[PDB]
Structures are given as C-alpha cells and as structure tokens.
Design a protein around this ligand. Structure first.
Ligand SMILES: Nc1ncnc2c1ncn2[C@@H]1O[C@H](CSCC[C@H](N)C(=O)O)[C@@H](O)[C@H]1O
Ligand SMILES: Nc1ncnc2c1ncn2[C@@H]1O[C@H](CSCC[C@H](N)C(=O)O)[C@@H](O)[C@H]1O
Ligand SMILES: O=C(O)c1ccc[nH]c1=O
Ligand SMILES: O=C(O)c1ccc[nH]c1=O
Lengths: 257, 268
C-alpha cells in the first residue's frame, strides 16, 4: 500500500497515455479499444440516470468522455492527493494540465453525433461536481458523510481494483466495497488489466494481482451483478513496453441485481 | 470590350492582400467556430464531404483554383485524388502554403478543420492521418491568373486536362463584373476534361472584403447569375445550394450576404 506513496502521476500518464499506447490514430490499439467499449455501451441507452461515480480515477479523464452526456452529476475519486491535484488542473483548465484533446476528439469520432471535441470537454468539466478521496479497502470507501449523492445510479472504474489488491480475495472484497455505493439496478463499467503483476509509475513499482477474464466474471457474480457484457483485448507486442507486464485488457458491463 | 483595365485594378489591389489578416478574418472564430453546426465553416465542409461521399467525383488529378492561403477546401477531396495541384496569383499565399506543407510551426493551424472533416466523413480517421495524406498528395503549388486564356501559362507543369476542379471564393473576388467572372470561368474550364467535375464555392451579393490594409473589390453575384454562367460554360449543374450569412457572422470584414456551393460536370 505504501508503494502508492511514490506514485508519480506524470510518469503514469506518460507510460500509459502518451505514444505508443497513447497513439489513437491506429484503430487496433488499446486506447481506441477502450474508448470504443465505453461509447458502444452508452449508445445502447440502457445505462442512464442522474449521478455517477468513477472509482480510482487517477490522473485520467478519458473514461468519462462518452459517459458525461448521460449523467448530470459526476463524482471523480482517487486515493492519492497528487492524482486529485492533477485532475483539478484539467478540470479548471489550469496551467500544465495534461492534454486529453486527442481522446476527446476520438470519442467524438467514435460516438458519431457530429460533436466537436470542445463541446465534449465543456460538458465533462461541467458535470464533474467533485473530486474526492476514496479507499476501496474500506467497507465504506467514501467515508461516512460524503458529499457524493448516494447511492449512485452507475459506477465506472478502470485499472483500479486489481492494481490495489494483493490477491484475488482482496480484489473480491474491494468489488464488494464499491458495490455498496451502487444502487440496486444500477450499472458498473469495470475496466482493468489481464494477468498483470506489476507496473511502474516513476520511482514507484506497484504490485498487481494477475486476474483472468473468467475470474473477473465470477467475482462480479459473487458481488451480486448480472454480467451484461465481458470483452477482452489482447495486448499487441508493439504495446508491450517495459512499463508493466499486462497481457490484455478486459471490459465488463455489469448490472447490480 | 477591353478587359485590361479592370484586370489591372484587380492585380493592383491584390498587392496589399495580407494572408494572416485574411486567415484571421475568415477562418478564425467566429466564422472559424466549427462547433456551431449552423456556421459557415461546417456548412462548407459538409458540402464538400457529402459531395465526395457520393463516389461520383473521382480520378487521378485535381486542380484547386485560387487556393489562397487555405487548405480546408481539399480535406474531403484528398482521399479521392492521387495528384493535386494548388494555385494562387500571389507568391505570399503560395509561401503560406509552403509553410504548411513543410509542417512548420509558423504555419496556420488547420487541425480543427482537419478534425472536423474527419468527424463528418464518418470513417473514424484521425486528423493527423488526414493531414499527412493531403501533404502527400499536393504535388505542386503554381502561380495562376484566371484572366489569361491559359490560366497556368503555356507548357505548364500541371497534368492537363485535370479530372476535377476546386475553387473557393476566387472567381468573384478577382472579377470586376459578371462578364469578367464568366470569362474567368471559361478560362479555368479549359483545364478540365469533358465529364470532369467542378466544385465551386463563393460569396453571394458581395462587393468588398478586407485583408489587412487591403479593402478589395468583389462583383456581387446571385445564385441564378452563378447558374447561368455554369451552363454558359458547358456544365450540367448537379447541385447548387445556398447558405445565408447569419447576422452574427457578418462582422464588417466583408459584405457577403450568403455563400453558394455548386457541383457541376463539364459537358463533352
Ligand atoms: N486503497 C485504494 N482505494 C481506491 N483507489 C486506490 C487505492 N490505492 C491506489 N488507488 C488508485 O488506483 C489507481 C490505479 S491506476 C489509475 C487508473 C485510472 N483510473 C485510469 O484508467 O488509467 C491510482 O490512481 C491509485 O492512486
Ligand atoms: N487574377 C487572378 N487569377 C487567379 N487567382 C487570383 C487572381 N487575383 C487574386 N487571386 C487569388 O484569389 C484569392 C481570393 S481569397 C480565397 C482563397 C481560398 N481559396 C479560400 O477559400 O479562402 C486570393 O488568394 C487571391 O490572391
Ligand atoms: O492504465 C493502465 O494500466 C492501462 C491502460 C490501458 C491499457 N493497459 C493498461 O495497463
Ligand atoms: O469571402 C469569403 O472569403 C467568405 C465569405 C463567407 C464564408 N466564407 C468565406 O471564406
């Protein structure tokens, strides 16, 4: 856990959201794949409501681009101060903010409603009301009297749980911990790494639990979800880059039942 | 009768045309605000994209007539032609294009326009690929005078006759009157093969516009004047659509009342 104390936001963004993993031009890469999963799911019309929470956002916003037009109250979270600070920089268009414009643009491309990427960002920034501390290990991940409208209509989380969990069972408990924040009938969009065991964030070396698709599936069941969709992306060689050892990325669409 | 004087005034005036001021006046916001779908920027891009989307405008060679310092008019086009000639009267415009071709940072930034063309062509192309394709396909930037019967000069470099022509806001902006306009249209029509296509965009009912110190003269034309000249030149008009300049886009940079888009195919 203390390992996340060395976690460098910029190095993380560099390793994961700049080229080659950050090149959105090629349809076969992980970035486009994730954006595609998110967009397709929301285009169904079946994930809707007023409030949404993003569990373990880190310094990233890409995972809400398609989401932001189906929820007017959005809550972002992370365990580290530095990540929340980094988010603020983008939300407030402050100086030195990370540049997400390529991703906004591509979400506008994929969604295909003729939306300009500035409108897209504008809405996102508008609908994110708060950026809050959170610890999934706690049965009440958001603490007692959070300003977060509970329970949420929907949840999103990407590359968080498996990355904060020593083993399968901690991963299971965490899933249970965040699930409490989710209204019955609500939706969870879980994105994460397949069979990963470590990744680097500057001086920080983080341990990861290597999970399989079927493992992810069963965990969702055991947490009280009906799995609407589970797809896998296999990591091409050219995107195996020495920053981690992830083999693939899973996308899960689940519904609390 | 004698075309020389008017043409001379025209050439004279254009010696004060300042590319940056023009780029600013016409392609920076609000006119350059690609976010408003009711805006002229988007309407122009739509007209081009939809037209190329028919698959009916095709071939090897394309010539853009009076390109000025702008490339937006070629964004949807460049996927449909291997060889594209760009052209302008003024060296300073030609140099501007050079700066963009070289991908210099001093260049005007067209990427909003690129992204927007990518958006409405609906093929999920990224804007960097679109721009790289345009830079690859532009084979040359030539001097041009549409008042000369051979607008490119004799023994020109351009592969003639072209398969297609593009021209935006050029013919009316350099012709003192309708007869001049028509002649200019006749001239460029010689560079196009029979059955070839001409995509024409221009100002409706404009008489002047600004480009720095330069306050330049435009022949005001109407849609029907434009239609007749096309027929008069040997074209079948496939499409002629009009955009009315909204008040908030009428900024004192010109007096254009609207914009026309013509898809025409040369008879022969
Ligand atoms: N105990 C804990 N509870 C909830 N989040 C935690 C946590 N310990 C670390 N995190 C956060 O989990 C994130 C893993 S990586 C960030 C992933 C980001 N959502 C994106 O999609 O790329 C980090 O931001 C990290 O600080
Ligand atoms: N006699 C002539 N023959 C051909 N082009 C001319 C000309 N005199 C001026 N031009 C060019 O006509 C242009 C009008 S401005 C339009 C530029 C660009 N195509 C656009 O769409 O914004 C200027 O570039 C100008 O230099
Ligand atoms: O953030 C990550 O760990 C990640 C994002 C996308 C693909 N693969 C990853 O490991
Ligand atoms: O005159 C122009 O250059 C012009 C008028 C209206 C819309 N767009 C233009 O470029």
């Amino acid at each position: 856990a203390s390992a996340y104390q060395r976690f460098e936001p910029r190095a993380y963004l560099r390793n994961n959201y700049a080229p080659p993993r950050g090149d959105l031009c090629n349809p076969n890469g992980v970035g486009p794949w994730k954006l595609r999963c998110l967009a397709q799911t929301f285009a169904t019309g079946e994930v809707s409501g007023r409030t949404l929470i993003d569990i373990g956002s880190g310094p990233t916003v890409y995972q809400l681009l398609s989401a932001c037009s189906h929820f007017e109250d959005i809550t972002m979270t992370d365990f580290l101060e530095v990540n929340r600070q980094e988010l603020g920089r983008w939300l407030q268009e402050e100086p030195g903010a990370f540049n997400w414009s390529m991703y906004s643009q591509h979400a506008c491309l994929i969604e295909g409603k003729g939306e300009c990427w500035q409108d897209k960002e504008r809405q996102l920034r508008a609908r994110v009301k708060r950026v809050l501390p959170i610890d999934v290990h706690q049965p009440q991940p958001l603490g007692a009297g959070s300003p977060a409208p509970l329970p949420a209509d929907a949840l999103v989380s990407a590359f968080c749980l498996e990355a904060v969990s020593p083993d399968l069972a901690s991963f299971q408990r965490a899933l249970d911990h965040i699930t409490t924040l989710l209204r019955p009938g609500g939706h969870l969009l879980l994105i994460g790494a397949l069979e990963e065991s470590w990744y680097l964030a500057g001086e920080a070396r983080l341990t990861v639990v290597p999970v399989s698709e079927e493992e992810v599936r069963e965990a969702l069941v055991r947490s009280g979800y009906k799995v609407r969709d589970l797809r896998t992306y296999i990591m091409p060689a050219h995107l195996q880059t020495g920053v981690d050892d992830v083999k693939g990325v899973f996308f899960a669409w689940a519904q609390k039942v």
